[PDB]
Motif scaffolding. Structure first.
Motif, mmCIF file in Angstrom:
data_model
loop_
_atom_site.group_PDB
_atom_site.id
_atom_site.type_symbol
_atom_site.label_atom_id
_atom_site.label_comp_id
_atom_site.label_asym_id
_atom_site.label_seq_id
_atom_site.Cartn_x
_atom_site.Cartn_y
_atom_site.Cartn_z
ATOM 1 N N UNK A 279 -62.321 33.724 97.696
ATOM 2 C CA UNK A 279 -62.556 35.133 98.109
ATOM 3 C C UNK A 279 -61.239 35.886 98.317
ATOM 4 N N UNK A 280 -61.123 37.102 97.754
ATOM 5 C CA UNK A 280 -60.026 37.993 98.109
ATOM 6 C C UNK A 280 -60.089 38.368 99.603
ATOM 7 N N UNK B 93 -58.907 41.054 102.715
ATOM 8 C CA UNK B 93 -58.526 42.471 102.976
ATOM 9 C C UNK B 93 -57.452 42.484 104.067
ATOM 10 N N UNK C 122 -64.251 44.787 115.134
ATOM 11 C CA UNK C 122 -63.651 43.608 114.471
ATOM 12 C C UNK C 122 -64.160 43.217 113.080
ATOM 13 N N UNK C 123 -63.280 43.190 112.077
ATOM 14 C CA UNK C 123 -63.573 42.586 110.748
ATOM 15 C C UNK C 123 -62.757 41.303 110.582
ATOM 16 N N UNK C 124 -63.337 40.219 110.064
ATOM 17 C CA UNK C 124 -62.684 38.892 110.103
ATOM 18 C C UNK C 124 -63.039 38.018 108.902
ATOM 19 N N UNK C 125 -62.073 37.216 108.479
ATOM 20 C CA UNK C 125 -62.284 36.087 107.557
ATOM 21 C C UNK C 125 -61.634 34.858 108.178
ATOM 22 N N UNK C 126 -62.347 33.748 108.153
ATOM 23 C CA UNK C 126 -61.797 32.445 108.588
ATOM 24 C C UNK C 126 -62.338 31.344 107.676
ATOM 25 N N UNK C 127 -61.463 30.439 107.245
ATOM 26 C CA UNK C 127 -61.849 29.118 106.697
ATOM 27 C C UNK C 127 -60.988 28.033 107.328
ATOM 28 N N UNK C 128 -61.592 26.854 107.440
ATOM 29 C CA UNK C 128 -60.914 25.601 107.854
ATOM 30 C C UNK C 128 -61.373 24.487 106.911
#
Ligand code: CA
Ligand code: CA
Ligand code: CA
Ligand code: CA
Ligand code: MN
Ligand code: MN
Ligand code: MN
Ligand code: MN
Lengths: 237, 237, 237, 237
Positions: B177-178, B180, B123-129
């Motif tokens: 941030x860019x 992927x 797993x590769x992940x990006x999260x913002x809230x």
């Protein structure tokens, strides 16, 4: 100069700057002279995992490091990071070699920051997880000798074509986005970081180690921060 | 010019560029002329929530929008985003006003991107809230008229000191941030986005709407993209 | 009888009940006769990973299965699960052997269910992740031959003391808590499941496979559901 | 009797069992006589949020409670929960009324438990989030007077048809699945819990409060645990 908070996995004892006479895990607040250390039974060539936790209620920075089939090492230090670090920071990984050397290979890295406000809709969050690094990892800032994409790993220090570590090398990777670690309405601020690493040396005495760090956003590699200074500090004060 | 994929909440029917004769939710692939729309029973001055989902297995971009105590509106469009968008993107919110006007207020915004590889550690992940926006939100790129920190909200278009919306305004916020969204070893790529919005106008005919968009990383506001062009498109082709 | 929805990793072609003449991944809706299959290049003795996704907007049940250093297999089937399954369900793993045999070893299992309402506070969620199984795993219901705690794994079918698989074996594990997969106010319902498995046989022809399934909460192993019936179905209708 | 660890929001000062002379937040270890309290500026009829955190590295149980537009109250107590609680537990919410009364309304409740092992695949996790409660909430165990589904809320104590709280009432809700809070290979164990509550009384002196608790799995309401005993304790020892 930069403002640095780091958890160091220090592979080489420099007893003249306060290292204990063994590899150790340490908490560094604005100095390579750790505020707290614990003995670390480092394993040449084995994949290890480090965990780092903090919250603004307890004001305690804690780390654990283990290997499969081995006991953990842990260290904690009471510190309020709101008093050390600015409101916005960047988070990163740093490593060095000197006249002694090692691979500083990062196989995975995750980070979670949460700010809970007194609003009913209270949660603000940042999370990333890297399990694969690509040759062009645009959401990382690479500094000094750090590279990405060899076997899908992040190499913090110089490795020859044949996996062999180079001496006198320093490299860092910072997450591209700045991280908000204090906010005026926050009632709880927490962060956790995990990285898995492979430190391998052809020598009985590897150097110098890997650090997870938090810095001012414009942080760069200090001049002359190879070897014992872990790419974090300009000097040993 | 820029490459744009957007879900539009289009508050004002421009029937000469293919809008239906009512407020609508639409999927926009490189054109303000939506590939699919659905009727949207927009509520002047009520807090609404939009959800956007996609995955690379189904290759279907889907959105839902509702208000408390009301039915949802939903729209879907079969598209492979690997064929439309580059491998790295930025994600954002865009809004406009024209000779008709509205507040384009964002109360919260979250985004989750996941790339699962064929590695065991997949797993590769990006999260913002964001539930609170600060006056200086360093992890957002603000473009045109967009501001942060009024009542802890993001105002995509110009508002006077007294909450009153200004005409002929365009503004965007992109996550710093860019992201992927394609990787050669990924077996599943997914993303979901949620934002809550407050569109309020003193007029019976608000304009022009709010969009969640994905773009090339260097994306900027096209010249003359106020009103019907939603700060996304240089023209109505 | 029980109501079953399953993704099968079917290791043994039973061509008289519609299997293709190779190992395959399939979507099963209330019948072992899959509604859709895809060829699966199953690897005797290699750790594999399966992913399962669904959402109530797209109404499409999709699965992917891979191994390290290999291409994926994927299958999808358009189905509205609100029309097949009751509002409350249990989620599980099932495996069998017959006169042909294999280990049905589960090394990890995660599940995430989300119901988003039209409330501003919209999200309802269940998540579990198992990376280690203990001898006494109180949050699993074990049925038939299933056991936990050998090498920290879940063994769905009987294994002798020496890792050797037993024929004519059937076992299941269900998560203890019932899962809410439909709610009257939900505007989006989604679920994802991941498990890593090790299917090993001393024979050139392993049987019979592993399934991720969703059932009525009181679901039990049907009589005579060893071999081709995967511990899911009472017969081959 | 049961083993109980609780964070109490205690609305009514019982000074003969060690309450301070004001509403307070407290940490209870196997006794209603809190090991630590802090003053709580409770607001009759306002929606509040409580957060509870713990980890096995710091061995510190911490809570924060706030309202919109108000300062927080916080309390911490150094305790190793591995020494107090069994390896498997249930987590719940408890409330009571006595001759003084209040609504004990739960609008949302979330819980996250994580066990990180020294395996490379280290993470074990449980998470639930309730923002809406249904009339038939099969993943909750309701005890005594607790009900679900009125305005999509959980009512821990008896309310008449007209929102009016009843005296001499006790009720609890436990998550259906047992939670693993210690494991022999765990290097870090953490949990966090959040609930939003509405405590409303027609009287100047509401009673008796709401608790988040962790118990032995078979935990039930002790006889005579209305009023000051919060549905947690059989007596005031
Ligand atoms: Ca050193
Ligand atoms: Ca329009
Ligand atoms: Ca078969
Ligand atoms: Ca009391
Ligand atoms: Mn050191
Ligand atoms: Mn339109
Ligand atoms: Mn089959
Ligand atoms: Mn008390």
């Amino acid at each position: 100069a930069d403002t640095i908070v780091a958890v160091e996995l220090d592979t080489y004892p420099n007893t003249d700057i306060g290292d204990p006479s063994y590899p150790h895990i340490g908490i560094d607040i604005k100095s390579v002279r750790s505020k707290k250390t614990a003995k670390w039974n480092m394993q040449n060539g084995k994949v290890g995992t480090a965990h780092i936790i903090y919250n603004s209620v307890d004001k305690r920075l804690s780390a654990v490091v283990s290997y499969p089939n081995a006991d953990s090492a842990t260290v904690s230090y009471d510190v309020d990071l709101d008093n050390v670090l600015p409101e916005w920071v960047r988070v990163g990984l740093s490593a060095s070699t000197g006249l002694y050397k090692e691979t500083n290979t990062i196989l995975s890295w995750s980070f979670t920051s949460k700010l809970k406000s007194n609003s009913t809709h209270e949660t603000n969050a940042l999370h990333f997880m890297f399990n694969q690094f690509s040759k062009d990892q645009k959401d990382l800032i690479l500094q000094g000798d750090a590279t990405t994409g060899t076997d899908g790993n992040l190499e913090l220090t110089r490795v020859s074509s044949n996996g062999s570590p180079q001496g006198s090398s320093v490299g860092r990777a910072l997450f591209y986005a700045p991280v908000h670690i204090w906010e005026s309405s926050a009632v709880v601020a927490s962060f956790e970081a995990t990285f898995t690493f492979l430190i391998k040396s052809p020598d009985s005495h590897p150097a110098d180690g890997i650090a997870f760090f938090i810095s001012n956003i414009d942080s760069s590699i200090p001049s002359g921060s190879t070897g014992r200074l872990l790419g974090l500090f300009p000097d040993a004060n």
